[PDB]
Design a protein around this ligand. Structure first.
Ligand SMILES: O=S(=O)(O)OC[C@@H]1O[C@@H](O[C@H]2[C@@H](O)[C@@H](CO)O[C@@H](O[C@H]3[C@@H](O)[C@H](O)[C@H](O[C@@H]4[C@@H](O)[C@H](O)O[C@H](CO)[C@@H]4O)O[C@H]3COS(=O)(=O)O)[C@@H]2O)[C@@H](O)[C@H](O)[C@@H]1O
Ligand code: NA
Length: 506
């Protein structure tokens, strides 16, 4: 029976992995992960269904869409009763371990062992983190706390290794979720990486300085009336929260300021990536010397992508390619296609069924996702989807990103910005509640964006208003509407949203 280690890093986006060949690949940002890929399978078209941490982690644990599992935003929590992935591995006879960032709000009580970040509401701290652990038994969760000194990524690795070495019943297979809190948003990298990339310019995306054909009234207002209101930015564009502000650039030329903020942003981020890649080398070295390399399935992914200055955007939440796509790599020592790529359209909701089937189980029938385990034996799964659904619910909060739904096929992406919050109490409250002068949560404009992702992979050119694409628009609207129905995301419980979205979809 196969062991499993599911490795997931916070906000580690596909641009920031060498094997995915972005403009950043020339920097060799992840040699260890690229090596994993060279001896594994790399998935080109893996998409988050809702790109923030807690909802994506709920989708992963439950195999269900946000609207089914009900963890819509960062404001909602999982129930322990919903820890279905770990329940399914328990039921197959595995010992189970949860290591690192949990961020699901409830106790990981369905695990045999856990040791998870508790500080700053589940995000944990980059230095001297505290953890909650099933080993502290004289206190009840969430007060069963320990503290460790030093850099968080190194400690996370140490927790996994210590469990493997001293705690696991070596007579049983194990299933472990190993979640790094880096690189995250903070980007508080370890001091040993201080001069990593000091002498190199990070490739800059053209879209950081040119957004001429991108977006729509839903993301910019009419004639850019909302250009300083929607979408936190790298440049000074966003009037409340941007990296020119945060990094205090003041050269006298705003374009220069944007450039320097991009450079600091990216260098800090990539130093955090480098910490994770180095720690992965430690982990894999241990697994190999312990005799576990050839009987352990290894997954490496990130909970969602992240905008690294593309279109002068930051963070995630958007359904734009860099935020929607998750890097996803699987090394199954049994799989013979080593260093292979798969273009299958998959979602984070498909992770649990696939893993379960990979070890001999059956894809759970109460899950929304399905198992593509057959790809590792060289067969496309039966009747598999050729398009993915996306919905971001958390209207405006934190980063002034409007709520939207969307469909992405192999050729086109259609986004519908509906600009509403599902809890109308929120209207009028601050989007960024720690800021005296925050914008307020208000309804934004309704609009469509259409991208040819085959010919315009960087989503530079919104096509929705080009008469040459009217039929395409029509077809994609039909598909969006039908997909929304197939997945049961029809908004009966939120009639305001239902009215707006149904009207927009003709
Ligand atoms: O998807 S992720 O990868 O997890 O990234 C999401 C994240 O979202 C925003 O940051 C918020 C995020 O970390 C969230 C937890 O999921 O926590 C929010 O901060 C809250 C608390 O954790 C903080 O401690 C702080 O509140 C305390 C406050 O409770 C106390 O009264 O006083 C304290 C004094 O130090 C402090 O004010 O702030 C709250 C804010 O909560 S709220 O925004 O929901 O109303 C994080 O802000 C993004 O900003 C981030 O970039 C990232 O996208
Ligand atoms: Na994240």
């Amino acid at each position: 029976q196969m062991n499993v280690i599911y490795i997931m890093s916070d906000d580690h986006t596909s641009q920031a992995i060498g094997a995915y060949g972005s403009r950043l690949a020339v920097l060799n940002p992840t040699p260890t992960i690229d090596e994993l890929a060279r001896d594994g399978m790399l998935f080109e078209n893996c998409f988050c269904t809702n790109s923030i941490s807690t909802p994506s982690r709920a989708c992963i644990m439950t195999g269900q869409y946000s609207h089914r599992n009900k963890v819509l935003t960062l404001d909602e929590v999982l129930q322990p009763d919903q820890e279905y992935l770990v329940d399914e591995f328990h039921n197959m006879g595995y010992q189970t371990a949860m290591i690192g960032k949990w961020h699901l709000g409830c106790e990981p009580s369905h695990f045999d062992y856990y040791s998870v970040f508790n500080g700053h509401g589940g995000q944990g701290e980059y230095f001297d983190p505290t953890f909650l652990t099933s080993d502290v038994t004289d206190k009840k969760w969430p007060n069963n706390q320990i503290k460790k000194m030093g850099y968080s990524s190194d400690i996370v690795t140490n927790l996994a290794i210590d469990w493997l070495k001293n705690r696991r019943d070596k007579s049983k297979p194990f299933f472990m979720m190993h979640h790094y809190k880096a690189p995250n948003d903070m980007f508080e990298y370890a001091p040993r990486y201080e001069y990593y990339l000091d002498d190199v310019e990070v490739p800059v995306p053209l879209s950081l300085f040119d957004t001429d054909k991108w977006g729509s009234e839903g993301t910019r207002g009419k004639n850019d009336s909302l250009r300083h209101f929607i979408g936190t930015s790298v440049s000074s564009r966003h009037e409340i929260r941007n990296y020119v502000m945060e990094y205090k650039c003041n050269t006298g030329d705003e374009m220069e300021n944007t450039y320097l903020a991009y450079q600091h942003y990216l260098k800090s981020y990539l130093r955090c990536v480098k910490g994770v890649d180095d720690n992965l080398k430690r982990l894999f070295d241990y697994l190999k010397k312990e005799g576990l390399w050839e009987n352990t399935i290894i997954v490496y992914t990130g909970d969602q992508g992240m905008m690294l200055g593309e279109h002068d955007l930051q963070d995630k939440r958007w359904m734009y390619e860099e935020s929607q796509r998750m890097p996803f790599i699987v090394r199954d020592p049994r799989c013979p296609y080593k260093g292979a790529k798969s273009d299958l359209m998959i979602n984070n909701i498909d992770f649990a069924p696939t893993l379960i089937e990979m070890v001999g189980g059956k894809e759970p029938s109460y899950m929304d996702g399905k198992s593509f385990a057959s790809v590792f034996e060289g067969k496309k799964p039966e009747n598999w989807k050729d398009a993915v659904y996306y919905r971001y619910w958390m209207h405006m909060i934190h980063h002034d990103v409007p709520a939207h739904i969307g469909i992405r096929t192999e050729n086109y992406k259609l986004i519908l910005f509906y600009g509403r919050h599902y809890d109308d109490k929120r209207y009028g409250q601050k989007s960024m509640s720690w800021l005296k002068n925050s914008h307020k949560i208000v309804p934004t404009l309704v609009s469509f964006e259409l991208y040819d992702v085959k010919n315009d992979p960087y989503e530079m050119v919104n096509l929705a208003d080009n008469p040459k694409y009217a039929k395409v628009l029509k077809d994609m609207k039909k598909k969006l509407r039908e997909l929304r129905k197939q997945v049961g995301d029809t908004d009966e419980a939120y009639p305001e949203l239902k009215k707006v979205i149904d009207k927009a979809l003709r």
